[PDB]
Amino acid sequence: NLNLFATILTYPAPASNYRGESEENRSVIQKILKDGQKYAIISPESMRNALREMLIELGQPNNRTRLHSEDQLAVEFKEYPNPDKFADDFLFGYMVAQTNDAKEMKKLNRPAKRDSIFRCNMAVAVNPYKYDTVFYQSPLNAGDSAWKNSTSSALLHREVTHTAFQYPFALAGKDCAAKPEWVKALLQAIAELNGVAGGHARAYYEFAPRSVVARLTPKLVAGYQTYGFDAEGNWLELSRLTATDSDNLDLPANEFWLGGELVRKMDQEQKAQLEAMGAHLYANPEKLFADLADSFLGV
Amino acid sequence: NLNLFATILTYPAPASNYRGESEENRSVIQKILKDGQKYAIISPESMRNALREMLIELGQPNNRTRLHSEDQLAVEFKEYPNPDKFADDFLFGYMVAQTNDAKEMKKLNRPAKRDSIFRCNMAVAVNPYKYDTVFYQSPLNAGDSAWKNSTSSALLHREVTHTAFQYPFALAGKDCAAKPEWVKALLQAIAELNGVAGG
Amino acid sequence: EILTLDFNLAELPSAQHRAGLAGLILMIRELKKWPWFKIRQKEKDVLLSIENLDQYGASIQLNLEGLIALFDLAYLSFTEERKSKFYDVITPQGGFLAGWDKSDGQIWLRIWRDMFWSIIKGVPATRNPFNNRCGLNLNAGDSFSKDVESVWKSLQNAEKTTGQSGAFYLGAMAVNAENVSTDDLIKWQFLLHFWAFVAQVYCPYILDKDGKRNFNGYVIVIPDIANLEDFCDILPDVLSNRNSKAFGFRPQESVIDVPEQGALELLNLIKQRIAKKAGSGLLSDLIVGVEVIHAEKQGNSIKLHSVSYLQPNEESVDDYNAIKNSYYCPWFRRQLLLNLVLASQSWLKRHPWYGFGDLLSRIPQRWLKENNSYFSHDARQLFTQKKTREYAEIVYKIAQGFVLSKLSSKHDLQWSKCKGNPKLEREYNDKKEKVVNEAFLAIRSRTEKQAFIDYFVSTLYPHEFVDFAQKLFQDTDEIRSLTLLALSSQYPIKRQ
Amino acid sequence: VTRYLRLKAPFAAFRPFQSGSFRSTTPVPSFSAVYGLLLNLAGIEQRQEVEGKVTLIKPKAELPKLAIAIGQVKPSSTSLINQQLHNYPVGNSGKEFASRTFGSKYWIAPVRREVLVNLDLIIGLQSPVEFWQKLDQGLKGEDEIYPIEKPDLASWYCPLEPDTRPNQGACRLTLWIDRENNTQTTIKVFSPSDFRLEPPAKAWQQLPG
DNA sequence: ATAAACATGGA
DNA sequence: TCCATGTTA
């Protein structure tokens, strides 16, 4: 009687997102001092925007468009979200209007104020930044054209790196049962994420699922904490395999299925026989999420 | 309705990209870290330029060319004659100012920004290299007919390495406006991709 | 009419109000020293009296004419002529500061005046009070009281609520995530009209491609007062004990590099004065906290950059007193201030400044490193300001041995003989330059866990004492930093 | 106190109450936020949730009575990770802005703010048996938090008097705030005390809410 | 290199 | 409420 939540990881590839805050003639990316080192990060807002973009791409109706305007970035094509259906897919439906639609006298619907479903965390890298730098040609557009030229040509430089990202869902409750079809579509959209960051078309980075593993009974999250993991290793495996071997009877491994994409290639039989005969199938994320939805329709 | 993307590689041979960003006496190539080792890079701008060049060569309508006759290199046909009606691959070049061709509204109703149909990525090697590899030599001067008068008289060095490298690319799916011959010609140009290098 | 106001320092929500109390008290004290003030007192029956001045509270008694006189003195202003490539610009007088800035040309005041136009009154609609009092002669009996009456009406019931305007230099009318308005007291809003005269101002800057300082905005320093009577007694001489040397059209001391530098500077002046002025408690007993604001104007809008709270600890003051000794500190070694911050008490001792010092030095100053040696890089950090200490010293020995031995093996010319004869120093020095910079750039790139140690073959090319690989193979960064920085010690000294 | 429980979290943010155009943060959460978090974790819904331009109109007549302290184990640093967040304009609000009126929130403008690298808290609650029982039922009944009360003791906080100059104290703090015209909360400054011993009775504060 | 995207109190 | 305006060493 809950909503399951998990953690995803991405295949390594060069970074794309330049996070502005440019100083002198260089573009940089924000860092965090996790243990005195550098790490590239992404705010959850970009993932929310990209997921809504995939929802509109799949054909699910919505009532909001962010279109490329010539003057300044803005969002339009939105009307009063009177029904919870046909709008915003049961999430992110804010409103702060001071005088609107006779409040509820003729709206006759809930204010939809300070409401959210599927609150997601923010992405973190797994490898420290080594102070890389790649220079940049950047010649002037023209010396004779009618259009301007910035009066000169410069020589820029930007930094890139290759690093995977991990990302938790943090979706719980049971109120999201009005539209199970919408839930399945949203799960498929997450499974089919690509170009989540707004970084740039060239050198594009895409978030494909890679060994997404987490589950729990109708109790609040604990145990693995979604972070504190090593890089390009078996953090999934080492962490939860060790915990479950220590907690085979303490926590139910039947509902909390297997972990790690590498163990799908070797020692799968030994781990399965030592732990349980549960629904620990792991071949591809697509069919995995398919059976998650199959088991979730009943709950 | 249908998307496509592929990763392609080539045959081994010495390096070709050269920029000399470090110094006059020592030339270096771009270097990237990977699992503690080092690898070579070919930036996507070079492939964009090469694709533009082959689209020039394959008898396709063009909206950009160089001059190679200026003290500092620039582009002329991209910005001077063309109001950006139809780019090479619908790239629809952008630039911001107080106005652009009468605010680019009345004369030609197009957005200021661009389309960016193509989707490329950085090219990376497959095996690491290691430090300096070859010597070099330079002359003293012209001597009698004094027109150059460099008077350098130095023995510089060059950096070479043998590696075959690969790179991915992707294409948009639902783009079909004026596609039938444009996109297939672009694909045919990709098929060869001959003249790309830093030198 | 007679009105009495009582204030307690504990009830103030922000340190700005605490500064406002001191500013108002200093305003009254300075105003009590003018012949025209007492002339108006004896003519129009002006009431102004501080009743209970102590450490914990304050009491004031005043009439309407007292408020008129205070607003006449505070909002005094005049007009100044500046040229263009002509126009009139109204400039505030500056109040009691005009009587304390003994620097030539009152250059400090100028900066203060500039700041008052930059951030204080960015919205021109708030410039009305200075427009009315332009050119007025208080010695000739000129006065203005139209706006004073409204303030008097409001102060008649100070306990009533009101709305915060932009006169508070932080936040907006409601921040306006939604329509919220704001809460404040009329008496509290009155206090904010005078704290701007106590704040300290410094000019930050950035470095361009050519290394020139480009100044942007200002840094405002606000003290937190613990004992009011002590503070108001000590500040008049603290201001008077400032330096007077000017760089260009700005004071040399006015130039700072980081927002926290000015906070240290102010309390350093306070610590100088506590030795100069006795009878008071420690700096903690005087100042509880320091507030630093970074601001800059952009068009018709005002943007903030950094807000922070500091601590008055003296052990950091002792360390900071060392940096000013070195003359013309380079902006790279200057970054030593950044690493000043049971975990981070002794983090400075490892000097892990190679990374960020190299990052900026690469881009525009790899070209400029040959220019003036940035005053010998403060003798290359004063030559490390002179077995882990022996581990640091062997690097210095090895670098010098390498450069000398390699230069000798190249042509067998010795600086001992070169210094003996003239007209041959710079030919030797040019080869020294071109033999050191190439190695420095070689170590500049191609740096990682394993490849770096193979470059040590070149360092010992013309070639106990081995039981340190358990450090070299493990750190790989401290040793790299030392080999990078100490190699610049052998870089040639400037001719002058 | 009856018993206390420990928790940790990797990321969090505590905005000053109407900080301004540019946001900021404090090293430790406000007491009101902690009280609200504990009340919600037990499953106790908010006493009043009326709707209008604003909310949070809370009388104290029907509200649990309880005493809360605060603790801290490991210092944490801060970072700034943001570039934009739209607002609601003040002024003409001209052209389209007035045309749309669809829960407006238009005129997106850049702005930065701060985050905390890590966070850990130790303090619990002194409360009657029934409240603790229903809190346990809310936690377990029909990131991670668990009670390690007796061991693993660290530094604490306490209001400071005009003496005994502290170190690295919190500039401001909030006790009980309602989003209306009021006097807000009385005491602002707080001081940390470092000793591996049970916090003094001064650390415990009986919350009016 | 452009490159931009706010406030007061006034009848 | 609405509708009156301001530039440099």
Numbering used by the authors:
A (entry chain E): 3 to 301
B (entry chain F): 3 to 201
C (entry chain L): 7 to 91, 118 to 373, 379 to 423, 434 to 510, 515 to 547
D (entry chain A): 11 to 152, 171 to 237
Copy text verbatim from the article accompanying this structure deposition.
We also observed a subset of particles within our cryo-EM dataset that formed a partial R-loop state, with only 5 nt of the TS hybridized to the crRNA, alongside duplex DNA bound with Cas8b. This led to the discovery of an additional structure, resolved at 3.8 Å. In our partial R-loop state structure, only 5 nt of the TS hybridizing with the crRNA and 3 nt of the NTS downstream of the PAM were modeled. In contrast to other type I systems, where the NTD of the large subunit displays poor density and cannot be accurately modeled in the partial R-loop state, the Cas8b NTD in the Syn type I-B Cascade structure is well resolved in both full and partial R-loop states. Comparative analysis of the overall structure of Cas8b in the two different states showed that its CTD extended in the full R-loop structure, with an RMSD of 6.7 Å. This extension was accompanied by a significant downward and outward displacement of 11.8 Å, 12.0 Å, 13.7 Å, 6.7 Å, and 9.8 Å in Helix1, Helix2, Helix4, Helix5, and Helix6, respectively. While the position of Helix3 is unchanged. This extension might promote the creation of the ssDNA-binding groove, which is vital for the NTS supporting and Cas3 recruitment. Comparison of the “belly” in the two structures reveals a pivoting motion of the extended Cas8b CTD, accompanied by a correlated motion and rotation of the three Cas11b subunits reflected by an RMSD of 3.15 Å. This motion leads to a reduction in the spatial distance between the belly and the backbone.
Type I CRISPR-Cas systems employ multi-subunit effector Cascade and helicase-nuclease Cas3 to target and degrade foreign nucleic acids, representing the most abundant RNA-guided adaptive immune systems in prokaryotes. Here, we present two cryo-EM structures of the Synechocystis sp. PCC 6714 (Syn) type I-B Cascade, revealing the molecular mechanisms that underlie RNA-directed Cascade assembly, target DNA recognition, and local conformational changes of the effector complex upon R-loop formation. The stoichiometry of SynCascade was Cas8b1-Cas7b7-Cas5b1-Cas6b1-Cas11b3. Taken together, these results suggest that both the “GNS” loop of Cas5b and the “GVP” loop of Cas8b are responsible for AYG-PAM recognition in Syn type I-B Cascade.
